[PDB]
């Protein structure tokens, strides 16, 4: 739960190129697939269980 | 990534007959009708 970003699954490590103003990540199915942690500045990827 | 976004329960199953066996049947029919 990162500021209302509730979900269920594992959080693997992703290293895709983003923009400083771009923190969210969506997909074709309009689901939150890639996220940026709010405290620390790395990138996580939601993968289901 | 349109093929790999199938996390939402949408699976594609392979056919029982593979391409090599289908081609072998095709060659068998061709041989039977030529010789
Ligand atoms: C969040 O606030 C903490 C202090 O409460 C700071 O984190 C420190 O950031 C410096 C960066 O120069 C590190 O050297 C320290 O080790 C950090 N301390 C920690 C994590 O306890 C900073 O202001 C903020 N941190 C982030 C990651 O945004």
Curated annotation (Swiss-Prot), chain A:
It comes from the Viruses. Attaches the virion to the cell membrane by interacting with host receptor, initiating the infection. The major receptor is host ACE2. When S2/S2' has been cleaved, binding to the receptor triggers direct fusion at the cell membrane. When S2/S2' has not been cleaved, binding to the receptor results in internalization of the virus by endocytosis using host TFRC and GRM2 and leading to fusion of the virion membrane with the host endosomal membrane. Alternatively, may use NRP1/NRP2 and integrin as entry receptors. Binds to host ACE2. RBD also interacts with the N-linked glycan on 'Asn-90' of ACE2. Cleavage of S generates a polybasic C-terminal sequence on S1 that binds to host Neuropilin-1 (NRP1) and Neuropilin-2 (NRP2) receptors. Interacts with host integrin alpha-5/beta-1 (ITGA5:ITGB1) and with ACE2 in complex with integrin alpha-5/beta-1 (ITGA5:ITGB1). May interact via cytoplasmic c-terminus with M protein. May interact (via N-terminus) with host bilirubin and biliverdin, thereby preventing antibody binding to the SARS-CoV-2 spike NTD via an allosteric mechanism. This is Spike protein S1. It comes from Severe acute respiratory syndrome coronavirus 2 (2019-nCoV). The lineage of its organism: Viruses, Riboviria, Orthornavirae, Pisuviricota, Pisoniviricetes.
From Swiss-Prot, chain B:
The chain holds residues 849 to 883 of 1273 of the full protein. This is Spike protein S2'. Subunit of the fusion protein that is processed upon entry into the host cell. Mediates fusion of the virion and cellular membranes by functioning as a class I viral fusion protein. Contains a viral fusion peptide that is unmasked after S2 cleavage. This cleavage can occur at the cell membrane by host TMPRSS2 or during endocytosis by host CSTL. In either case, this triggers an extensive and irreversible conformational change that leads to fusion of the viral envelope with the cellular cytoplasmic membrane, releasing viral genomic RNA into the host cell cytoplasm. It comes from the Viruses.
